Write a protein that binds this ligand. Sequence first.
Ligand SMILES: *C/C=C(C)/C=C/C=C(C)/C=C/C1=C(C)CCCC1(C)C
Length: 133
Amino acid sequence: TRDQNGTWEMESNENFEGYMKALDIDFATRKIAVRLTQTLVIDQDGDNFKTKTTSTFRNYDVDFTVGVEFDEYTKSLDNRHVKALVTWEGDVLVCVQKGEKENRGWKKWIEGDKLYLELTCGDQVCRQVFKKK
Ligand SMILES: *C/C=C(C)/C=C/C=C(C)/C=C/C1=C(C)CCCC1(C)C
C-alpha cells in the first residue's frame, strides 16, 4: 500500500544515536532524544503530506508534496539547508536531502500494520518501526 495515513506510535528505534551523531546533533540532545517515545502523525491527501512528529521534549513538523522539490532548513535538528525531494519507488516513499551530508534522506513503507522508517546520513542507518495507535 501507498497509504501511510495515521497516528503512528514508535515501537522501536535502532541506531538513532549513530544517525544523530552523523548529523552533528550535540551530545546532550542526543542523550535525551534516544530515550523518547515518538508519535508520528501523517495526514496524506493524494500527493500532499502533512507530518507531525511529537515527543515530550521536541517536535518536528514537515509538509511536502510528492514529486515537488523543496527547500528545507532543518531548524531544531542540525540547522542546515538542503534541497529535498520525496518520491515513490514502488510502495516505498523515498526522500533525498541534497546538501552537505552525503547519503542523507529516508525511506518509509508499510508492512502488515507496521510503518517502517529508515533514516540515513553518511555511513549511518537508523531503523524505526511504528504501529497505528
Ligand atoms: C515521514 C517521516 C518523517 C517526516 C520523519 C521524521 C523524523 C523526525 C522528525 C525526527 C526528528 C528528530 C531528530 C532527527 C533528532 C532530534 C529528535 C527529533 C525527534 C526532533
